[PDB]
Amino acid sequence: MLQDLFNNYVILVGILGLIFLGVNYFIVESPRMDENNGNISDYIEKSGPFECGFSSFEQSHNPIPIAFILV
Amino acid sequence: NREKIELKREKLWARAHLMPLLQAEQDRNVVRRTFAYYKREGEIMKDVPWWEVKSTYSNKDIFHPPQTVLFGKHIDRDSGLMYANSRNRFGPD
Amino acid sequence: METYELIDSDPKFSRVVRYFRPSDYLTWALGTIGAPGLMVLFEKIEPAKGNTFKMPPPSIMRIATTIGFFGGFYYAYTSSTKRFWGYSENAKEVAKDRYEVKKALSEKKSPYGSSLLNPYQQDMSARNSTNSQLLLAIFPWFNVANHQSHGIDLRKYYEVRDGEENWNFTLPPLDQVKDLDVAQYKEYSNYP
Amino acid sequence: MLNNLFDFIEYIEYWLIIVAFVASVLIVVAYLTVAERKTMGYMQRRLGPNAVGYYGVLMAVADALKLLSKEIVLPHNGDIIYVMSGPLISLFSVLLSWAVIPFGPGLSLLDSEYSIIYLLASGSIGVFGTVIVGWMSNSKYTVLATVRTTAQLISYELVLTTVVFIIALIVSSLNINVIIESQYNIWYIIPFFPLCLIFFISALAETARPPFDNVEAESELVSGHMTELSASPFVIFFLSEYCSMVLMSTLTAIFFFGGYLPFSNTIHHLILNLFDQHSIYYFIIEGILLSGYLAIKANFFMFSFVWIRAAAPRLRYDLLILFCWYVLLPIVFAIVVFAPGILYCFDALPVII
Amino acid sequence: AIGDYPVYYKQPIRWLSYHAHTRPHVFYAIAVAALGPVFMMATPLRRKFLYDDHEPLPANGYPLPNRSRDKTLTGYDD
Amino acid sequence: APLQQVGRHGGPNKCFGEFQRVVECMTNAKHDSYEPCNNLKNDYLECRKHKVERYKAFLMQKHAEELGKDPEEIGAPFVRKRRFLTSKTLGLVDGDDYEIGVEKI
Amino acid sequence: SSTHTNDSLNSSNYVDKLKDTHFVFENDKLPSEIPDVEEVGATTAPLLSAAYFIGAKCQDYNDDFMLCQKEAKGNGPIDCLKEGRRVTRCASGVLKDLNTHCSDEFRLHWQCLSFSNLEYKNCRKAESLLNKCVFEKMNLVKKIPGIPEDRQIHLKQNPVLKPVALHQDSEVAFKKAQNENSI
Amino acid sequence: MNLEILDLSILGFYSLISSNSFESIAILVATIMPVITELWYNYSQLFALLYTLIYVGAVVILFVFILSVINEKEEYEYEYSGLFILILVLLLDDLDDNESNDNDYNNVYITDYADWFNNYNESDLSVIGNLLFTEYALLLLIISFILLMSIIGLILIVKKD
Amino acid sequence: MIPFEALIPYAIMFAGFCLGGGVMNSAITADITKRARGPNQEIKRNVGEDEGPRNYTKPRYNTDQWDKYFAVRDLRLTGSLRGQSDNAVAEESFKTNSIQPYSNTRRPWVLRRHIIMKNSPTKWARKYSSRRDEREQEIKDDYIRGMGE
Ligand SMILES: CCCCCCCCCCCCCCCCCC(=O)OC[C@H](COP(=O)(O)OCCN)OC(=O)CCCCCCCCCCCCCCCCC
Ligand SMILES: CCCCCCCCCCCC(=O)OC[C@H](COP(=O)(O)OCC[N+](C)(C)C)OC(=O)CCCCCCCCCCC
């Protein structure tokens, strides 16, 4: 049994995943070519969490009861 | 599943008939490499008068082939791709 | 130590039950009714609720009878096993064992019986089940296979003892008895 | 050149074989997204995408290219680890599961006696990659969806694993190719029709497809774990989810419909008798034929994924847990005892050959 | 007493019906699972009425003839 | 007596025979003490780790260094890459240095 | 079985890298005191095709070589060299007779095995022709021990499991004998 | 270059600087993956796959418990460490990776000799099952007993009723 | 009324599978047959005139250890892991071209480098305590001392 062909496939899968990130990164127009609202870091109104329009309590680190924990 | 049993029986007996000729060839290979081990040991430790070339097992009536070797030439040391600039296996380049 | 004659170092499950004495059945009944009876005694010794006697509910007596029924059989199984092992007096069981083996030998049948198991599994089964009755109080394990590892030599069945002349069993040599190890590996030494 | 050019192709030949293997799977996944909308459209008495490319053949290309041209939303450029690690784990898991799928006899990248275990083990990693999106996230819809993913995983994982083990038990092998070739005289749909339903029900729950789409329930959790995902992280998760639909459809065809075996042995011989076996063209046609049989069976179950979405409403996940633990598990563990008993009674315990 | 809960040891048949009507996921899973050992108990019938068990596979290595080495064998000598 | 040292195909492995001869020696009733079975114990342990045999190879390599012997002139030829187990290295009549196929058997 | 071992080639070159595997040769021949013998030169498919004829011709020598191994009591590979050389010559004799008497029938069968994953069930038609040719010219009959002669799988009229793909050469060669021999 | 050494170097760095409980449940997965791959490529592919099949199901259950117990404590807390003390610690650790001191056992390479006697050739899992279900069947039945106790144990701990 | 427009994506999906199978079945089978022709490139690529029709070898599956020994044995005869030869006698070079893999037997890297997994009472003893290796060095020393007798 020889798995050298399988090794090459696994290598390709790992590289192929990084291609989607890279290609999207090199293809998007720079923000200055767009409305030019600056880098995404400053635009906190965009990077904030989605709550259907209205902000709410930031409960990210509060514990969540789980009703199926026994199962 | 009842034919698979018969198909397995045919395969098992086919391998049984080839087993002696395949093992006889394998037995000669092990014996050939066994003498090559003790010949290499005899050459390296010849000038040591007290050294005895023998196996490491006390039971002398059981054949224990050696399982270690001393490494020599690296044949594919200068290899590229699709071609190994293979060094001479039999003697100096 | 008051040792006796070894009959079977690993008696089969059916042989142990068949060789039950009438007392072994008596103790089986005592175990079965001893568990509901102890529930009455414990209530009599000290009532579960309050200070007055109250009969335990029928559902408790149902599960108690089942627990006693299994306990009564395990006790009877170990009582009969000791006779096969020679730890307990087994004069009656030796005479019955000798008749059954000599009868089967004369028919050229295995005293142990034919098995679905191959030679490895017969050996493996005997390894798992032999002496397992010493832990029958903890968890169950029984010999329900026809293996040949019984700790006995079948040549001792070829000498007639006192009270066995009227049986008139003509015993063939062991190499003609079907399904025995000494009459199985005829062509190949690794196949029966 | 000449000689160097010719044997360089030999040096690169197997990489092209993998590239062709990757290309073939991505074409089915890309056009499954188109086929689902076309199938749902006509069942809903609409058309579905027919304006993007000739008769809608470029709709999948447009969706990918548009999403690949979108800004990625994240607090900082260095925060790629947060919302990209999850999509990659999910995508790498399903893609690696395709290494054991044989398009023909011996035509799998990985062949081993434990291909069944590799298949189940690889897909379990994808479940982990999904929950990573709700990594102490401040998005309550992503957090609510992560809880439901775990609840669904507990539901289907036992049933899906045990069903595949019964099929492996009937052939006494964990090699996927041996299971396919064991179905020459009978397709396991006939002896194990109950298990085919259970496998498909488990596949719907594994892929978070309706009626078990409780993870990405739009009417409940806007987009589930994808509510904060845009551009490339959204494509990768979407691509992996539809890759899993193709994988589970192909596994339904392998475990119960004979894999690549022909529908008609007579017709299969008739078609192949036209081509000389001493020519390479015979093996092209045979490769097309055998994969076509696998394609036809897998197309029907990819159709069935779309079909059940357009006919059945969604079931709450707490009901899914009771359904899998009180109904499916007792039935499957009954068959895992039923099947060896039948085979032993008729002296037909399976062996590998 | 139109729809009471049957007592198993008094009305075994009605007790079976209650669970087959109200808990099908329990009644029929057990019924399928019972068919396993029942078929294993019907195996002795098959060995007497349909066909016998197959001969065991030679899975114990090379079959060595149960005899002494032939000391008169010649041929293909050095 | 439970089975020990079972090979990957169900039968005895390489070192079972050494272990079996140790058990037979230790449990034989003809032995006053366990001294006769001491060499059998070392043989079994040598079958698994080969520690004394590896130690002998350590001495031979070291003794060859101090006398100036070339490692590549007294050792055994070897190949590290499986793709270059070529027909020229194997010694075939029409041998070649082109790589062998190991991608799919 | 694809288990990684230290006695043969493993699955991939990542296994060699982790183990730092060295593929070692030995240029020394067998010692001159041991008599020489020409090895068997057939590969996997011809050997499997010829397996039951080597068994029917070298049964005495195969058993004697194996019985030597049992009586060797651990000193196996040394004490059965002479018996092994008989086995090699007898097996080469069968392969020699195949290439002179049943060459086309023999090469047909193991070319089907190469075409069909080396599964005996996929190449019954070529095997039947080879069995008929060998029996007429070498008086060798394939027998599967332990079972009745009429329950041998290779003689089954209507097998349950049949090849999906047909070897075209075997189909042609089977038709030719049907119309010319069994009139 | 053995790239598994680099993987464990990164993992050891992230175990020293890990702060919250989510990072710990990631150190576990970042540990099983090097184990699974190294078992796959060197010693046992069967147990590489068994690890993936069993540990992943345990990991997700472990992850879901983190959601129900996360308690705000370590997001806003501060750690000091120091980059220099971290890297120096990892350098000193990397210096000594010889778990065994038998130099000959670690340096001299060995081989095994194949034989053709095993004509009934099956996978390691078939032999493991053959022994586990026949000779060590008691071990299997005790394991079944322990699994039953866990089922009862989990209920009597968690269930309020 | 069969909607043909809805069936178009299924036709492309069908052709997606056929692309993979058509390439894999033919490309792999051709390469195995090509490399089974001989031990060098001039025989693999060129086709002799006196040769007959090309017989193809299909890819192998469901193998065991015997097939690994067969593959290496075929390589020593033909230079291919699936070479073809029915000669009753091998070449002279087959007697001395055996391949013996020699490998280290060290514990996995994760065992001896993981920050947590490498710590245990017996692992510390094996790594930092010389009590075990002192005893085993006595056994090795007896081997050379006892040579003279
Ligand atoms: C497909 C690839 C997926 C992974 C790509 C992302 C690479 C990041 C590291 C992956 C694993 C390497 C080892 C990390 C172990 C876990 C330690 C950890 O806390 O995660 C590191 C990550 C970085 O956060 P950072 O800002 O650098 O440090 C905190 C500063 N106060 O802090 C985080 O919490 C982010 C973690 C995101 C979720 C990762 C879940 C683990 C996935 C592991 C799969 C691969 C297994 C490991 C292989 C490499 C081994 C070193
Ligand atoms: C022994 C032979 C085994 C048969 C094999 C199949 C087993 C299936 C079991 C179903 C039981 C069931 O539907 O269960 C219903 C449960 C819970 O329902 P409930 O709350 O108990 O109400 C019903 C109880 N009544 C009616 C007695 C009061 O949830 C469901 O609605 C599950 C819906 C599953 C639909 C999935 C779609 C799959 C489409 C497949 C297209 C190819």
Query: Within a 10 A sphere around the Cβ of F103, how many other Cβ atoms?
Result: 21
Task: Using the structure block, give the residue that is written with the tokens 């710590």.
Answer: I119
State if residue D304 touches ligand 2 by the CB under 6 angstroms criterion: yes
The contact set of I with B (CB < 8 A) is 66, 69, 95-96, 98, 100, 102, 143, 147-148
Q: Which of F87, I92, F94, G20 is nearest to B89 (CA)?
A: F87
- How many residues are recorded in chain I? 149
Cα–Cα dist I62/H123, whole Å: 11
**C77 contact partners, CB below 8 Å, separation of at least 6:** C16, C17, C133, C136
Amino acid at F60: M
Structure-block tokens of residue D138: 């401040």
Are I19 and D23 a contacting pair, CB within 8 Å? yes
CB within 8 Å: A66 and H75: no
Cα–Cα dist G132/G178, whole Å: 13
Are I22 and D287 a contacting pair, CB within 8 Å? yes
How is G8-77 classified by DSSP, letter by letter? S--S-HHHHHHHT-EEE---PPPPTTSPP-PPP-B-HHHHHHTHHHHHHHSHHHHHHHHHHHHHHTT-HH
Instruction: Indicate the DSSP class of residue E65.
Output: B
At what angle are helices G168-180 and G103-115 packed, to 10 degrees?
140
CB within 8 Å: H67 and A69: no
Amino acid at C169: F
β-strand pairing of B71-74 with I100-102: unpaired
CB within 8 Å: A70 and H68: no
The contact set of I with A (CB < 8 A) is 63, 67-68, 81
Cα–Cα dist A22/D1, whole Å: 35
Cα–Cα dist C21/C25, whole Å: 7
At what angle are helices H21-38 and H45-69 packed, to 10 degrees?
170
Structure-block tokens of residue I41: 């490139």
In chain I, at which residue ranges do the beta strands (DSSP E only) sit? 100-102
Q: CA geometry: angle at I12 spanning I6 and I15, to 5°?
A: 140
- How many residues are recorded in chain G? 183
Cα–Cα dist H116/B24, whole Å: 10
Are G66 and G15 a contacting pair, CB within 8 Å? no
Largest CA distance in chain B: 67
Cα–Cα dist F56/F68, whole Å: 19
Structure-block tokens of residue F53: 């045999």
Structure-block tokens of residue A57: 């309590």
Q: Which of H41, D108, I110 is nearest to G2 (CA)?
A: H41
**Helix, strand, coil shares, percent, chain E, to 5:** 45, 0, 55
Ligand 1 atom 7, closest CA: D81
Query: Which atom number of ligand 1 is nearest to the Cα of residue H23?
Result: 19
**C103 contact partners, CB below 8 Å, separation of at least 6:** C169
SS3 C188: strand
**Three-class secondary structure assignment of chain B:** CHHHHHHHHHHHHHHHHHHHHHHHHHHHHHHHHHHHHHHHHHHHCCCCCCCCCCCCCCCCCCCCCCCECCEEEECCCCCCCCECCCCCCCCCC
For chain A, say whether G13 makes contact (Cβ under 8 Å): yes
Structure-block tokens of residue A13: 């899968």
Task: Using the structure block, give the residue that is written with the tokens 């880098």.
Answer: A39
Nearest to I147 among B15, B29, B51 (CB): B51
Peptide bond into D211 cis (omega under 30): yes
Using a CB-CB cut-off of 8 Å, the residues of chain D touching H75 are 136
**A63 contact partners, CB below 8 Å, separation of at least 6:** H67, H68, H69, H70, H71
Judged by its nearest atom, the ligand closest to the C-alpha of residue H14 is 1
Q: Which of D292, D273, D291, D293 is nearest to D282 (CA)?
A: D273
Nearest to F81 among G9, G13, G26 (CB): G13
Buried b (16+ CB within 10 A) or exposed e, C129-163: bbebbeebeeeebbbebbbbbbebebeebeeeeee
Task: Using the structure block, give the residue that is written with the tokens 């594919």.
Answer: B76
Number of H helices, E strands in chain A: 2, 0
Identify the bridge partners of residue I103 per DSSP, sorted by sequence position.
Answer: H110
CB within 8 Å: G1 and H123: yes
User: If you measure CA to CA, which chain D residue comes closest to G163?
Assistant: D184
**H87 contact partners, CB below 8 Å, separation of at least 6:** none
SS3 A44: helix
Query: Within a 10 A sphere around the Cβ of D330, how many other Cβ atoms?
Result: 16
Using a CB-CB cut-off of 8 Å, the residues of chain I touching F86 are 79
* In chain D, alpha helices (H): 3-43, 59-68, 80-97, 115-131, 140-171, 176-181, 193-206, 218-221, 232-256, 265-272, 280-309, 317-323, 329-345
Using a CB-CB cut-off of 8 Å, the residues of chain B touching G74 are 59, 61-63
**H160 contact partners, CB below 8 Å, separation of at least 6:** none
How is H41-75 classified by DSSP, letter by letter? III-HHHHHHHHHHHHHHHHHHHHHHHHH--STTT
Identify the bridge partners of residue F78 per DSSP, sorted by sequence position.
Answer: B74, G24
CA distance E60 to chain G (A): 14
Task: Using the structure block, give the residue that is written with the tokens 């589970």.
Answer: D248
Backbone angles phi, psi at B83, to 5 degrees: -150, 130
CB within 8 Å: I109 and H2: yes
Cα–Cα dist B39/B31, whole Å: 12
- Going from the Cα of D14 to the center of ligand 1, the distance in angstroms, rounded, reads 33
Backbone angles phi, psi at G43, to 5 degrees: -90, -170
Cα–Cα dist D217/D209, whole Å: 10
Q: Which of D211, D43, D288, D53 is nearest to I9 (CA)?
A: D53
CA C72 to chain centre: 15
Using a CB-CB cut-off of 8 Å, the residues of chain B touching H113 are 26, 30, 65, 67
Q: CA geometry: angle at C24 spanning C22 and C27, to 5°?
A: 115
Query: Which atom number of ligand 2 is nearest to the Cα of residue D322?
Result: 17
Task: Using the structure block, give the residue that is written with the tokens 């070498």.
Answer: G138
Ligand 2 atom 32, closest CA: D323
β-strand pairing of F76-79 with B71-74: parallel
Structure-block tokens of residue A48: 């904030």
SS3 I101: strand
**D263 contact partners, CB below 8 Å, separation of at least 6:** D293, D296
Are H16 and I121 a contacting pair, CB within 8 Å? no
Cα–Cα dist D170/D193, whole Å: 14
How is H68-107 classified by DSSP, letter by letter? HH--STTTS------HHHHHHHHHHHHH---S---HHHHH
| Structural determination approach | cryo-EM
Sheet containing strand I100-102, edge to edge, reads: B71-74, F76-79, G22-24, I100-102
Query: Within a 10 A sphere around the Cβ of B18, how many other Cβ atoms?
Result: 24
CA distance G171 to chain H (A): 32
Amino acid at A19: I
Q: Which of D84, D222, D230 is nearest to D143 (CA)?
A: D222
At what angle are helices H45-69 and D140-171 packed, to 10 degrees?
150
Cα–Cα dist G128/G124, whole Å: 6
Q: Which of D326, D302, D292, D333 is nearest to D40 (CA)?
A: D302
Cα–Cα dist D224/D131, whole Å: 11
SS3 H110: strand
Interface with chain E: mutation pick from B2, B8, B9, B17, highest number of E CBs within 10 Å: B9
SS3 I103: strand
For chain E, the distance separating the N- and C-terminal CA atoms, rounded to the nearest angstrom, is: 98
At what angle are helices B2-44 and G59-72 packed, to 10 degrees?
60
Checking phi first, is residue H11 left (phi over 0); if not, alpha (psi -120 to 50) or beta?
alpha
Structure-block tokens of residue C65: 């009878």
Q: Which of G5, I100, G34, I73 is nearest to B23 (CA)?
A: I73
CA distance D11 to chain B (A): 7
How is chain F classified by DSSP, letter by letter? ----SB-TTSSB-TTHHHHHHHHHHHT-TT-SSSGGGHHHHHHHHHHHH-HHHHHHHHHHHHHHHHTT--HHHHSEEEES-GGG--HHHHT-TT---BPPP-S--
CA F47 to chain centre: 8
Identify the bridge partners of residue F98 per DSSP, sorted by sequence position.
Answer: B83
For chain D, say whether A70 makes contact (Cβ under 8 Å): no
How is D76-131 classified by DSSP, letter by letter? SGGGHHHHHHHHHHHHHHHHHHGGG--SSTT--S---TTHHHHHHHHHHHHHHHHH
Judged by its nearest atom, the ligand closest to the C-alpha of residue D211 is 2
Cα–Cα dist D176/D112, whole Å: 9
- How many residues are recorded in chain C? 192
At what angle are helices I121-128 and I131-145 packed, to 10 degrees?
50
Cα–Cα dist H158/H155, whole Å: 5
Enclosing H/E stretch for I142: helix I131-145
Exposed (0-12), middle (13-18) or buried (19+): which is D311, by Cβ within 10 Å? Answer: exposed
Q: Which of G136, G51, G126 is nearest to G95 (CA)?
A: G51
Number of H helices, E strands in chain E: 3, 0
Judged by its nearest atom, the ligand closest to the C-alpha of residue D314 is 2
State if residue D201 touches ligand 2 by the CB under 6 angstroms criterion: yes
Sign of CA dihedral C86, C90, C91, C92: negative
Nearest to D351 among B4, B81, B82 (CB): B4
Structure-block tokens of residue G136: 């007429």
For chain B, say whether E58 makes contact (Cβ under 8 Å): yes
Backbone angles phi, psi at I11, to 5 degrees: -65, -40
